[PDB]
Design an enzyme around this catalytic site. Structure first.
Site, PDB file in Angstrom:
ATOM      1  N   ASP A  37       0.811  -1.215   0.000  1.00 35.11           N
ATOM      2  CA  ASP A  37       0.000   0.000   0.000  1.00 35.11           C
ATOM      3  C   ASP A  37       0.840   1.258   0.000  1.00 35.11           C
ATOM      4  O   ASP A  37       1.425   1.609   1.027  1.00 35.11           O
ATOM      5  CB  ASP A  37      -0.950  -0.015   1.204  1.00 35.11           C
ATOM      6  N   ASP A 223      -1.488   5.705  -5.500  1.00 37.68           N
ATOM      7  CA  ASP A 223      -1.918   4.866  -4.400  1.00 37.68           C
ATOM      8  C   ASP A 223      -2.243   3.435  -4.842  1.00 37.68           C
ATOM      9  O   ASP A 223      -3.322   3.172  -5.366  1.00 37.68           O
ATOM     10  CB  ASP A 223      -3.131   5.544  -3.726  1.00 37.68           C
TER      11      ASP A 223
HETATM   12  C1  LIG Z   1      -3.370   6.793   6.153  1.00 42.70           C
HETATM   13  C2  LIG Z   1      -4.658   5.977   5.941  1.00 42.70           C
HETATM   14  C3  LIG Z   1      -5.502   6.623   4.837  1.00 42.70           C
HETATM   15  C4  LIG Z   1      -6.620   7.387   5.148  1.00 42.70           C
HETATM   16  C5  LIG Z   1      -7.376   7.971   4.125  1.00 42.70           C
HETATM   17  C6  LIG Z   1      -7.001   7.801   2.786  1.00 42.70           C
HETATM   18  C7  LIG Z   1      -5.883   7.019   2.472  1.00 42.70           C
HETATM   19  C8  LIG Z   1      -5.136   6.449   3.508  1.00 42.70           C
HETATM   20  C9  LIG Z   1      -5.426   6.802   0.995  1.00 42.70           C
HETATM   21  N1  LIG Z   1      -5.025   5.389   0.722  1.00 42.70           N
HETATM   22  C10 LIG Z   1      -6.058   4.369   1.028  1.00 42.70           C
HETATM   23  C11 LIG Z   1      -5.375   3.021   1.228  1.00 42.70           C
HETATM   24  O1  LIG Z   1      -4.432   3.179   2.273  1.00 42.70           O
HETATM   25  C12 LIG Z   1      -6.337   1.873   1.572  1.00 42.70           C
HETATM   26  C13 LIG Z   1      -5.561   0.556   1.754  1.00 42.70           C
HETATM   27  C14 LIG Z   1      -6.496  -0.645   1.947  1.00 42.70           C
HETATM   28  C15 LIG Z   1      -6.908  -1.022   3.231  1.00 42.70           C
HETATM   29  C16 LIG Z   1      -7.770  -2.119   3.379  1.00 42.70           C
HETATM   30  C17 LIG Z   1      -8.218  -2.835   2.260  1.00 42.70           C
HETATM   31  C18 LIG Z   1      -7.795  -2.457   0.978  1.00 42.70           C
HETATM   32  C19 LIG Z   1      -6.939  -1.364   0.832  1.00 42.70           C
HETATM   33  C20 LIG Z   1      -8.276  -3.223  -0.278  1.00 42.70           C
HETATM   34  C21 LIG Z   1      -9.725  -2.837  -0.689  1.00 42.70           C
HETATM   35  C22 LIG Z   1      -9.901  -1.334  -1.051  1.00 42.70           C
HETATM   36  C23 LIG Z   1     -10.413  -0.520   0.169  1.00 42.70           C
HETATM   37  C24 LIG Z   1     -10.771   0.938  -0.184  1.00 42.70           C
HETATM   38  C25 LIG Z   1      -9.550   1.809  -0.515  1.00 42.70           C
HETATM   39  C26 LIG Z   1      -8.641   2.014   0.697  1.00 42.70           C
HETATM   40  O2  LIG Z   1      -9.106   2.441   1.754  1.00 42.70           O
HETATM   41  N2  LIG Z   1      -7.347   1.729   0.507  1.00 42.70           N
HETATM   42  C27 LIG Z   1      -6.513   7.284   0.010  1.00 42.70           C
HETATM   43  C28 LIG Z   1      -7.145   8.587   0.541  1.00 42.70           C
HETATM   44  C29 LIG Z   1      -6.231   9.834   0.463  1.00 42.70           C
HETATM   45  C30 LIG Z   1      -7.080  10.374  -0.691  1.00 42.70           C
HETATM   46  C31 LIG Z   1      -8.079   9.209  -0.502  1.00 42.70           C
HETATM   47  O3  LIG Z   1      -7.764   8.396   1.821  1.00 42.70           O
END
Ligand SMILES: CCc1ccc2c(c1)[C@@H](NC[C@@H](O)[C@@H]1Cc3cccc(c3)CCCCCCC(=O)N1)CC1(CCC1)O2
Length: 375
Positions: A37, A223
């Site tokens: 990630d 991302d």
């Molecule tokens: C620091 C934590 C955080 C909080 C908010 C956040 C983010 C990150 C940015 N990245 C999101 C990803 O970290 C996250 C990873 C993930 C966690 C759990 C499961 C998955 C993916 C796979 C399924 C997709 C879930 C939805 C996207 C997601 O939250 N991805 C993406 C954004 C920044 C702009 C949108 O929002």
């Protein structure tokens, strides 16, 4: 050894459910699959039973475990977890031949974080300390790797499409066999997320002609943990209008454009030709210079099981997210040492009859400074 060929094809996953790499934690080594990630900065693993976990980190069985006596939680876009910070020894079997002591959040509770049968049990946040939880003093895994070893301060991602998905995470460098043509680099604007600046957007060669600030409102990030290309409201609306108009010889349910309904065609009759290419122009390395990456409809129409697809461009109120669908078919270099992200056409690029995904430059773009959002 630690040579790059050992990391080729080290990633697996399911469509829409992230890419994961195999890792081990503790002594004796415990094996877990870890989502890769670039959109977060915490290394966290299931550490207690959960209906969706096939296995989890057992701290009691590791003799190198050290409790940091501190709690932690991370809220992502749709799910969250909480747990207990510690340190332990971590390796990546199909990675560099090293072992580091890293920060690890042991997940004891979670809500909508793990996914039913995804095959991963944890997450590796590869972005910067600034967005680490609880705060920016919890060193992220990659910072620890670089500090404790001679592994160069960069990694690259080759995310391949189709249903299973595969790819490579080259830790410590660039593997020239995974891309063709030139690498094009865009500055990391600020070290928190992998933030970049979009300076122009074209659809089928037609400039969207919005103020370039709209593209980066309120940020643009690369991302790997997000599936879709996510666009700020105004941009999303203009892109959708443009994509609707280009494809208006077919009929679509309205829930399709919102990403809820599938659309289906007789196996092998998908009318790719009516969906436009999208070109995103990124700020380059020299004054007044940009470059473009071109996205094919095969990237933003995600196959889900007649051939069936979800519209993988969606709306955002938190800026532009260049997610997995954009990264797929490109080789992406996260060159932290030089504060830049490189793009090149991947070796596993997507095929269209008459069209090709491309990374092209140089372009001239005046006033690229003005594209960055500021409060
Ligand atoms: C620091 C934590 C955080 C909080 C908010 C956040 C983010 C990150 C940015 N990245 C999101 C990803 O970290 C996250 C990873 C993930 C966690 C759990 C499961 C998955 C993916 C796979 C399924 C997709 C879930 C939805 C996207 C997601 O939250 N991805 C993406 C954004 C920044 C702009 C949108 O929002």
């Amino acid at each position: 050894k630690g040579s790059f060929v050992e990391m080729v094809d080290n990633l697996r996953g399911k469509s829409g459910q992230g890419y994961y790499v195999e890792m081990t934690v503790g002594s004796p080594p415990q094996t877990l699959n870890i989502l890769v990630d670039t959109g977060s900065s915490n290394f966290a693993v299931g550490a207690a039973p959960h209906p969706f976990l096939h296995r989890y980190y057992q701290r009691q069985l590791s003799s190198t475990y050290r409790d940091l006596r501190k709690g932690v939680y991370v809220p992502y876009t749709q799910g969250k977890w909480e747990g207990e910070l510690g340190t332990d020894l971590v390796s990546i079997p199909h990675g560099p031949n090293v072992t580091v002591r890293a920060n690890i959040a042991a997940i004891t509770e979670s809500d909508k974080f793990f996914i039913n049968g995804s095959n991963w049990e944890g997450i590796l946040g590869l972005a910067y300390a600034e967005i680490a939880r609880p705060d920016d003093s919890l060193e992220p895994f990659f910072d620890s790797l670089v500090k404790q070893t001679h592994v160069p301060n960069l990694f690259s991602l080759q995310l391949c499409g189709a249903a299973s998905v595969g790819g490579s995470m080259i830790i410590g460098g660039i593997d020239h066999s995974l891309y063709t043509g030139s690498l094009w680099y865009t500055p990391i604007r600020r070290e928190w997320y992998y933030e970049v600046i979009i300076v122009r957007v074209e659809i089928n060669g037609q400039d969207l002609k919005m103020d370039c600030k709209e593209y980066n409102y309120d940020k643009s990030i690369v991302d790997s943990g997000t599936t879709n290309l996510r666009l700020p409201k105004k941009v999303f609306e203009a892109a959708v209008k443009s994509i609707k108009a280009a494809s208006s010889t077919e009929k679509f349910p309205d829930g399709f454009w919102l990403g809820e309904q599938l659309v289906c065609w007789q196996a092998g009759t998908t009318p790719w030709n009516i969906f436009p290419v999208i070109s995103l122009y990124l700020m380059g390395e020299v004054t007044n210079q940009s470059f473009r990456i071109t996205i094919l409809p095969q990237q933003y129409l995600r196959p889900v099981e007649d051939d069936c697809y979800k519209f993988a461009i969606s709306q955002s109120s938190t800026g532009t997210v260049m997610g997995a669908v954009i990264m797929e078919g490109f080789y992406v270099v996260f060159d932290r040492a030089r504060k830049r992200i490189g793009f090149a056409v991947s070796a596993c690029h997507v095929h269209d009859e008459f069209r090709t995904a491309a990374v092209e430059g140089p372009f001239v773009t005046l006033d690229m400074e003005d594209c960055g959002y500021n409060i």
